[PDB]
Design a protein around this ligand. Structure first.
Ligand SMILES: [Mg+2]
Ligand SMILES: [Mg+2]
Ligand SMILES: [Mg+2]
Ligand SMILES: [Mg+2]
Ligand SMILES: [Mg+2]
Ligand SMILES: [Mg+2]
Ligand SMILES: [Mg+2]
Ligand SMILES: [Mg+2]
Lengths: 212, 233, 204, 205, 222, 125, 198, 222, 205, 198
């Protein structure tokens, strides 16, 4: 698994792969690793599938409740902390999750918080999590610029996942992209890595050592 | 979190055209010591069910107490206790299967394997297994422990599928059960020669045979076996 | 810790109408890290093909050992080793290391030059022979290949059709195995000619 | 005892009497609760009139007996007939010197004209003990009391066969690892007689 | 020490068609090397046009299925006989499963039915409640033998149009119930040939707007 | 004690002759005649049974021996030497071939193996 | 584990190897050269267990130096690597196995092409455009996969290794104290003393 | 695996199933477990397949050499003592459980050998995971002085008990009959009761389906 | 059995006869090979005519008997004299419900006018078995044969004391965990009689 | 473990704390501030286990801020530290103990003196001129013991901390990515933005 989220000029780019494995067995090549908490917040799935899926859907509920009570949109800081604090209550019991809570509010601007089952909650501009994280970071680090256009940013996130899908046995399937703006997130498609690898190779000229 | 102490071996059973038969020897072993020779492991519930139990004997004795209680409690404010609202094999089974699974889920199992054999009020034969883990299954033949390995292959040659049930008579069924019990005395080191057998028929009701003994055994050929390879005398 | 799961890879061989086929993937990895996409697992000594899956250092060592042994054989016997014979040589070579085995899964495919009968065989790591008339599978996606082969296979296919069959058995089996893929190669073997085709497949 | 190998369990004993000595044993071998062979012969001949009752590991005791049989055949060819004490010593040497890898409790019984009948028990450690009678095997625990109460020196053949028969039936009664038939081998000046008693007889005594 | 879990073998398969869905499973129940039953149904009609199978440790499978059927009964009670939609059944099962997150139901569950638009639907679950809506999913012992086949024959993976130099993928036409059942039977006979825990019988439950229909075929008994 | 004869007993004489080999060949010359004839569909090897007495049972002494189910041998020379060469040949057929290739060796190779055994007796100590 | 990277460009092989030697709680040296010249046109870098690493490398060098003299010839890089692989593959089932991973960069004077071989402690050899051992590849391969071209100049290779080392210095947890880079080409082996800042 | 040996009036018959497993997967649906030690001494083996073929071929080889040296036909007690001393030497590490039967100048014999080195003599024996199902049959129908025809059926039925009831056994039945005055008759696939039904569809692909990148000719001859 | 706690080892038995039932036991407790007490009393009174033989953990069995004695004293105060079957059920309830923490092998023997003598044996798991006589304790293994062969129903007091005296001496002979004096408690209509037999007597029988 | 150093000069307390957060194979952040302002004149830095660290810190902050408001007074540093010690000493025999080590640097406006408290996860409190947690002290204490004087100026402490950080960067194996330094004095708490190079 490889998931990433980065902050830029036009919002947040969230990109993830979609493979699930049990040992050497590829359980699914179509896993949804981005949980749509609500129309404004996104969460990435890494670690335990059930754990992330369950607690992030629940998060989606606690956020709705907050908005009903306070009549104001929940901040990413508070939303993430709801999850983070919960996870800390269960510390030592065995939950497994590495996730990025992404949102873009008026008060905060684009905001990404990495939250894990150990209790860590960190604000940041770029995060990659999963078995393929190291590969995604290489690509991300060398091409990331705060002034990227929404089209180039989406591509970078997409490319970084591709880099991880190629090398990491545990990542692949397809890439799901999302662009997070203040008015909500916009889904930017599902791209089969099989087909995407060949396109990127001819167009970009990369992966030269791979014959095709 | 426990370990069985006094134990009972196989319980075998099979269903035939008008009923079911179930049998189990009368031993209660303490490891390899064949300690108690007068243990009844077949428990009749009313006049239409027999529960055969293998495994830990102190736990079987507990299940016995529970069954007698079910009967007492079902008679309460029940004008039809000896008729329309009497305990059915399916009720006794589901109850036990419930207890077994609850006990395993609390990590304190009743260390047993149980077969509930009986005949429902509308004539249907009932044969179903439940063990220490709450696992349950039904088949034309059912046997626990060792008997699952040696008795089932034999009983299955008689009733291999559902369609074979209506073609099998009590005479045939009882013969097969009795032979399986002999094979088990031959090859199971924890068996006893003394056993009990029960037949639950939709017409003749419950016939419970106590103090049966495996007879017609073949041991004569042993006279001609000497050494373990080359010894001639 | 499981030497048969460190590097990844699969091989499958099938028999047809006056032909055999043996195919393999091209991945070499180190646990999750893909390392090479050019690691062929099928080797041939004359007209006998041997595919080997398993721990890569042993795969390489065994190819070298069989080349050595088949070279000497050819010199002493003055003729190239046959599939039936080589099969026995592989088996005896593997069992020689019964208590410190090579972690591999060899597969032999070939056609006897005298009788023309197609031949394939598989072995476990200590030499047990499986001489099937249909197909042999080996590797980290052996269950998958068994599934594919049991459904896709039908007897007496022509070279042109066996190709499609073995290719699909291989391709789809690999796509459900994390440690296999990154390319594939299929050999269609006939009495007179042997054709080698590289397949286009996902690279994740 | 190695994991999963065939065990002899057993109820074996050898009893000396006026005319000589009698060996007895059950005939059951087990792998867990499965009876691998219900009609085994645990009374093994290592020489014409020197036999042994085997208990413990089936493989070990067969291997050992096979080697003692060989050593005694070669002894015989060179120095004449071996004493029971010599046969016991050869058995002991093997059991003692390989105590770490073997599980063998062997009772050696034999007949000589100078010495009459003799019994030697070689327990797990490899020690040798000469006794009037000896019992071993897993079923023996149950008849320690019975045997000590009923054994008398210089009994008759009839009486000894009875003693062995009653003892082993009790042993077989209580021990799950013992069962089958009761085999006996009578060793006297007259020769070697093989006896066998079936369940139907011994079970109800 | 006591081990609260067991493995009863079995293999199940759910395939969603355009306006139908099937959930098939073998009928064999095993323990180690013994057959416990050659006919012990594993796929059940839970009411409301929803079929379910919780495969793995049969005691947990039984418990989970009993709890869900009961969830359906109370949903009606508590919500004026409203029909429980498949997506709602799925979410509800997630909660049942995750309720036992620290002492899991050792089962791989699959439910099939029709969504609110009347299109076929299959949902598959983790032993702890992760779930996703899918096209087809094999579960259990021979899942690894069946899945690759379905990918090739249901989703047409790796297949290309003859003549196009592998540049045009085979078009995704959708299968009829008749063709799906062929695949299911073949998936099972093939699995039976190579997996010792698969055999005896295959029972398929088919779901359409007309309801739940059952089909049964024998499988090799060795 | 011990085989201290670790030196060759066959050595080259000034004329380039290997004495012991020439003398062994002379021993072969005084032996009974044996022949072999190769046909299109078979081979025949034959020899005479020079029984050294009429009280001996000539059948208990086979001069024509089976080495493998498809290979036979006959000789002329010292009988006991042949007997041990046959044992060694039957054995090597197994050790250097059947236990490796699952089939009996081809004639030339078995021949080559016996020959090696004989050469070493010509140089070993 | 230390950092060992190699990249084969059009006319040469560049090996970049970390400079630190860490023993427990303290960094003992910051100028370590994890490489041995096997022959004038073959260089091998290595990473692994403490003493095994140098002992193995010096043993291979001695052996290759002996061959060169007995034969008055320099073995091809492919030959040196096969020899190295066989040695590693011998120890894997030895009493105490050498735990050494090596990269062999050599320039084949006969074929007139540079070659890079990657062989792990088990004797797993593979020929590649670029390679690494341990975790190094995890951070750098995405960069190499992206930017690598077979017709790169030595300068283009060096710029790429620099980017690789930068990603390693940003995301990898231990301070490996920089790398010593060496180029192997038709003229031999030279140490590029300019990499701390280029 | 299920292997049996049954002694009859003037001979001995051994039989076995033909399924080879690696865990729950059927690696070989028709392997041969009946090995020839010598023309009239055959052995059925269970356990580790490489070990049963290896120990059998080795002893068979040495037995062949012993026969040529002694000018006598091989005896079962020889294969028995050789096999057992070898197996004992390896302390159980060579997983060969065998049923050795045969006819030789002294008569007909049947013995069993467990991996650790112990042997047994009997009139009917079985070994393998299917050992209990087969023995249940042998214990139900064996009688002394069986005819050749009765013994083949008995041994054949015992194997069937295992094929049907043991997941570790399956496919076909191999029998080898060794009669005192005749040549041993190996009946490979004496019974074949598990043929796969015809598949529901043909999976032959249209040519061109697979995407090929490069094609080239392989040079075989030197 | 907890590490280092006092063990009863024992040779205990209860035998019913014509006039009632007799309980017997050796008197040795041990901690490893040390005899902590060589003159203990394993025959415990839980009611006037309901006694028990204790074996297993000394601590556990005392705790249990102490509680039973209390339950029966309260039962008596409210409902009159308890049947031996009732006394057994109480013992069983305790042994079974607490099987994970106890090591109590208890033999319950009592005398009633309606039921004559009765014997119930409660083995390690807490199951209950009514029998004509029972034997337990570590020494019991050695007399399974002797006891099965010599017990007869309806023996006389004199005969039963002799049967119990011979059996236990055998048990004491073979079991290192049994020894001392042999104690008996005769329960009949006439009352309660306490018998004690010393080594110089029972040893040479 | 992270780097946490503290030095008490004449009129202030300086706390230096590393900026890296490492999770497994990668450094996730290089700008982490491992400190919480407990009161306007009290700061606490912390290092230890992943989540316990910030959870404990924010809990102590919340509690001190509550005392400040209920009472309209700022507890002395000595008081804040005894409160922190008892909290740590409570968890040590708890179900799941906090594994957090802290340094509390405060300026006591009543005594007009700066104070530094070092408290380990067990609730072991000691007042010192300079302190550190984990391994940090192993490398830096020989320097502090040598160059430390009670009458140093703020600028003299900063130069001493710089030398300390240099030794750590030379000899310590992990790249802690630098330190954030904060000074606590009569006028409050200020972050020294100039330390990457001074
Ligand atoms: Mg495999
Ligand atoms: Mg793959
Ligand atoms: Mg990948
Ligand atoms: Mg018995
Ligand atoms: Mg709904
Ligand atoms: Mg199957
Ligand atoms: Mg089967
Ligand atoms: Mg004593």
């Amino acid at each position: 698994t490889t998931t990433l989220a980065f902050r830029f000029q036009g919002g947040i780019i969230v990109a993830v792969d979609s493979r699930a494995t049990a040992g050497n067995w590829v359980a699914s090549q179509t896993v949804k690793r981005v949980i749509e908490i609500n129309p404004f917040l996104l969460g990435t799935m890494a670690g335990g599938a059930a754990d992330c899926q369950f607690w992030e859907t629940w998060l989606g509920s606690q956020c709705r409740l907050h908005e009903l009570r306070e009549k104001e949109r929940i901040s990413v800081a508070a939303a993430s902390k709801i999850l983070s604090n919960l996870v800390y209550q269960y510390k030592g019991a065995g939950l497994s999750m590495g996730t990025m809570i992404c949102g873009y509010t008026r008060k905060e601007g684009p905001t990404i918080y990495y939250v894990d089952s150990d209790g860590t909650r960190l604000k940041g501009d770029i995060f990659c999590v999963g078995s393929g994280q190291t590969f995604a970071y290489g690509v991300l680090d060398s091409n990331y610029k705060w002034d990227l256009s929404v089209e180039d940013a989406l591509y970078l996130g997409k490319r970084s996942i591709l880099a991880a899908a190629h090398r990491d046995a545990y990542s692949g399937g397809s890439v799901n992209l999302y662009h997070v703006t203040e008015d909500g997130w916009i889904y930017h498609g599902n791209h089969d890595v099989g087909e995407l690898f060949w396109k990127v190779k001819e167009e970009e000229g990369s992966f030269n050592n791979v014959i095709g | 979190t426990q370990q069985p102490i006094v134990t009972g071996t196989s319980v075998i059973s099979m269903k035939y055209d008008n009923g079911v038969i179930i049998a189990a020897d009368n031993l209660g072993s303490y490891g390899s010591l064949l300690r108690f020779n007068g243990v009844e492991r077949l428990i009749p519930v009313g006049d239409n069910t027999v529960v055969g139990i293998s495994g830990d004997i102190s736990d079987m004795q507990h299940i016995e107490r529970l069954l007698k209680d079910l009967v007492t409690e079902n008679a309460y404010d029940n004008p039809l206790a000896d008729a329309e609202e009497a305990l059915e094999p399916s009720y006794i089974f589901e109850y036990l299967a419930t207890v077994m699974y609850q006990r395993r889920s609390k990590m304190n199992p009743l260390w047993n394997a149980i077969i509930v054999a009986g005949v429902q009020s509308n004539g249907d034969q009932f044969l179903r297994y439940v063990n220490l883990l709450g696992v349950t299954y039904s088949s034309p033949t059912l046997a626990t422990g060792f008997g699952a390995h040696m008795a089932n292959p034999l009983l299955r040659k008689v009733v291999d599928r559902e369609s074979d049930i209506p073609k099998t008579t009590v005479q045939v069924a009882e013969e097969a059960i009795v032979n399986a019990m002999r094979v088990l005395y031959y090859r199971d080191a924890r068996s006893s020669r003394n056993f009990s057998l029960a037949i639950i028929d939709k017409n003749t009701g419950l016939t419970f045979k106590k103090n049966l003994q495996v007879e017609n055994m073949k041991w004569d050929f042993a006279k001609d076996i000497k050494g373990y390879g080359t010894q001639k005398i | 810790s499981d030497p048969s799961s460190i590097n990844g890879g699969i091989v499958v061989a099938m028999t047809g109408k006056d032909c055999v086929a043996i195919a393999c993937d091209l991945r070499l990895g180190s646990q999750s890290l893909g390392v090479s996409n050019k690691f062929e697992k099928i080797f041939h000594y004359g007209h006998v093909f041997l595919g080997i899956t398993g721990l890569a250092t042993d795969v390489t060592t065994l190819n070298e050992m069989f080349r050595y042994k088949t070279n000497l054989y050819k010199l002493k016997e003055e003729r190239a080793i046959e599939p039936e014979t080589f099969t026995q040589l592989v088996s005896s070579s593997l069992y020689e290391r019964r208590f410190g085995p090579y972690f591999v899964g060899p597969v032999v495919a070939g056609i006897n030059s005298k009788s023309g009968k197609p031949f394939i065989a598989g072995f476990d790591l200590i030499g047990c022979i499986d001489e099937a008339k249909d197909f042999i599978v080996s590797g980290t996606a052996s269950d998958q290949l068994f599934g594919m082969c049991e459904s896709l296979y039908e007897p007496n296919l022509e070279p042109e059709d066996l190709f499609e069959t073995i290719s699909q058995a291989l391709l789809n089996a690999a796509d459900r195995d994390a440690l296999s893929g990154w390319g594939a190669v299929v050999y269609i073997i006939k009495k007179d000619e042997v054709v080698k085709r590289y397949l286009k497949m996902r690279q994740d | 005892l190695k994991k999963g190998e065939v065990s002899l369990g057993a109820s074996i004993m050898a009893v000396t009497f006026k005319d000589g000595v009698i060996l007895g044993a059950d005939s059951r071998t087990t792998t867990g609760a499965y009876i691998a062979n219900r009609v085994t012969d645990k009374l093994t001949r290592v020489h014409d009139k020197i036999w042994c009752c085997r208990s413990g590991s089936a493989a070990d005791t067969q291997a050992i007996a096979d080697i003692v049989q060989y050593h005694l055949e070669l002894y015989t060819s060179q120095y004449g007939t071996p004493s029971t004490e010599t046969a016991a010593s050869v058995f002991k040497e093997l059991c003692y010197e390989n105590k770490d890898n073997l599980t063998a409790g062997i009772i050696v019984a034999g007949y000589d004209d100078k010495n009459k009948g003799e019994v030697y028990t070689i327990p797990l450690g490899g020690s040798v003990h000469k006794l009037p009678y000896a019992i071993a095997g897993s079923g023996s625990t149950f008849i320690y009391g019975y045997c000590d109460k009923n054994f008398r020196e210089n009994m008759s053949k009839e009486e000894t066969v009875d003693f062995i028969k009653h003892s082993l039936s009790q042993a077989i009664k209580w021990d799950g690892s013992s069962g089958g038939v009761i085999r006996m081998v009578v060793l006297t000046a007259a020769g070697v007689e093989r006896l066998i008693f079936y369940p139907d007889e011994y079970e109800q005594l | 020490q006591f081990n609260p879990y067991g493995d009863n073998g079995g293999t199940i398969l759910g395939i969603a068609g355009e306006d139908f869905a099937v959930l098939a499973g073998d009928t064999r129940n095993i323990t180690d090397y013994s057959i416990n039953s050659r006919y012990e149904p594993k796929v059940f009609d839970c009411g409301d046009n929803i079929v379910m199978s919780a495969n793995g440790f049969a005691a947990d499978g039984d418990a989970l299925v009993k709890r869900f059927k009961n969830s359906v009964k109370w949903y009606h009670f508590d919500h004026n006989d409203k029909k429980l939609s498949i997506n709602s059944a799925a979410r509800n099962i997630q909660h049942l499963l995750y309720g036992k997150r620290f002492f899991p139901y050792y089962v791989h569950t699959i439910i099939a039915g029709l969504d609110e638009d009347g299109k076929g639907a299959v949902y598959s679950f983790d032993p702890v409640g992760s779930y996703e809506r899918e096209q087809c999913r094999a579960g259990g012992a021979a899942a690894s033998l069946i899945m690759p086949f379905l990918d090739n024959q249901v989703n047409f993976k790796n297949q290309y149009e003859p003549g196009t130099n592998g540049k045009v993928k085979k078009p995704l036409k959708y299968l009829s119930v008749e063709e799906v059942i062929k695949l299911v039977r073949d998936s099972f006979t093939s699995a039976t040939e190579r997996h010792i825990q698969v055999g005896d019988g295959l029972e398929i439950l088919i779901v359409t707007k007309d309801g739940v229909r059952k089909e049964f075929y024998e499988l090799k008994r060795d | 004690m011990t085989d201290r004869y670790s030196f060759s007993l066959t050595t080259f004489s000034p004329s380039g002759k290997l004495g012991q080999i020439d003398y062994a060949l002379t021993a072969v010359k005084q032996g009974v005649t044996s022949l072999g004839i190769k046909a299109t569909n078979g081979v025949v090897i034959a020899t005479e049974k020079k029984s050294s007495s009429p009280l001996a049972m000539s059948e208990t002494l086979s001069k024509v021996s089976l080495l493998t189910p498809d290979i036979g041998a006959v000789y002329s020379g010292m009988g006991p030497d042949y007997r041990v060469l046959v044992d060694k040949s039957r054995k090597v057929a197994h050790t250097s071939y059947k236990r490796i290739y699952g089939e009996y060796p081809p004639t030339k190779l078995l021949v080559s193996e016996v020959a090696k055994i004989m050469q070493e007796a010509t140089q070993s100590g | 584990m230390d950092i060992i990277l190699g990249i084969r460009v059009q006319d040469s092989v560049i090996l970049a190897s970390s400079k630190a030697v860490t023993r427990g709680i303290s960094v003992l040296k910051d100028s370590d050269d994890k490489t041995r010249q096997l022959s004038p046109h073959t260089l091998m870098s290595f990473a692994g267990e403490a003493g095994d690493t140098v002992q193995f490398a010096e043993y291979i060098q001695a052996n290759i130096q002996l061959y060169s003299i007995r034969e008055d010839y320099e073995l091809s890089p492919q030959a040196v690597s096969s020899f190295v692989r066989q040695e590693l593959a011998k120890s894997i089932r030895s009493r105490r196995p050498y735990q050494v991973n090596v990269l062999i960069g050599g320039y084949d004077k006969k074929k007139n092409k540079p070659e890079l071989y990657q062989i792990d402690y088990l004797g797993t050899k593979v020929e590649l455009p670029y390679g690494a051992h341990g975790y190094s590849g995890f951070y750098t391969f995405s960069l190499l996969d992206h930017h690598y071209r077979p017709d790169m100049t030595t300068e283009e290779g060096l710029d790429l290794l620099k980017l690789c080392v930068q990603e390693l210095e940003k995301r990898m947890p231990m301070d490996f104290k920089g790398v010593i880079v060496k180029i192997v080409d038709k003229d031999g082996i030279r140490q590029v003393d300019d990499f701390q800042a280029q | 695996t299920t292997i049996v040996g049954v002694k009859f009036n003037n001979g001995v018959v051994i039989a076995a199933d033909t399924r080879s497993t690696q865990g729950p997967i059927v690696a070989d649906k028709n392997c041969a477990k009946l090995h020839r030690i010598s023309p009239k001494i055959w052995c059925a083996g269970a356990g580790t397949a490489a070990d049963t073929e290896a120990v059998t071929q080795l002893i068979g080889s040495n037995i062949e050499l012993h026969s040529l040296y002694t000018s006598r036909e091989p005896r079962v007690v020889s294969a028995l003592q050789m096999l057992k001393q070898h197996l004992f030497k390896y302390q159980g590490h060579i997983g060969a459980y065998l049923i050795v039967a045969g006819v030789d100048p002294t008569g007909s014999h049947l013995f069993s050998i467990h991996a650790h080195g112990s042997t047994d003599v009997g009139y009917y024996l079985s070994l393998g995971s299917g050992s209990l199902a087969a023995m249940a049959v042998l214990e139900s129908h064996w009688k002394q002085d069986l005819t050749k025809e009765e013994a083949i059926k008995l041994a054949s039925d015992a194997i069937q008990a295992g094929i049907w009831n043991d997941l570790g056994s399956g496919s076909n039945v191999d029998v080898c009959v060794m009669e005192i005055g005749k040549d041993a008759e190996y009946l490979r696939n004496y019974l074949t009761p598990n043929v796969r039904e015809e598949k529901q569809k043909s999976y032959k692909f249209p040519r061109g389906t697979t995407a090929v990148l490069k094609e080239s000719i392989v040079n075989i001859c030197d």
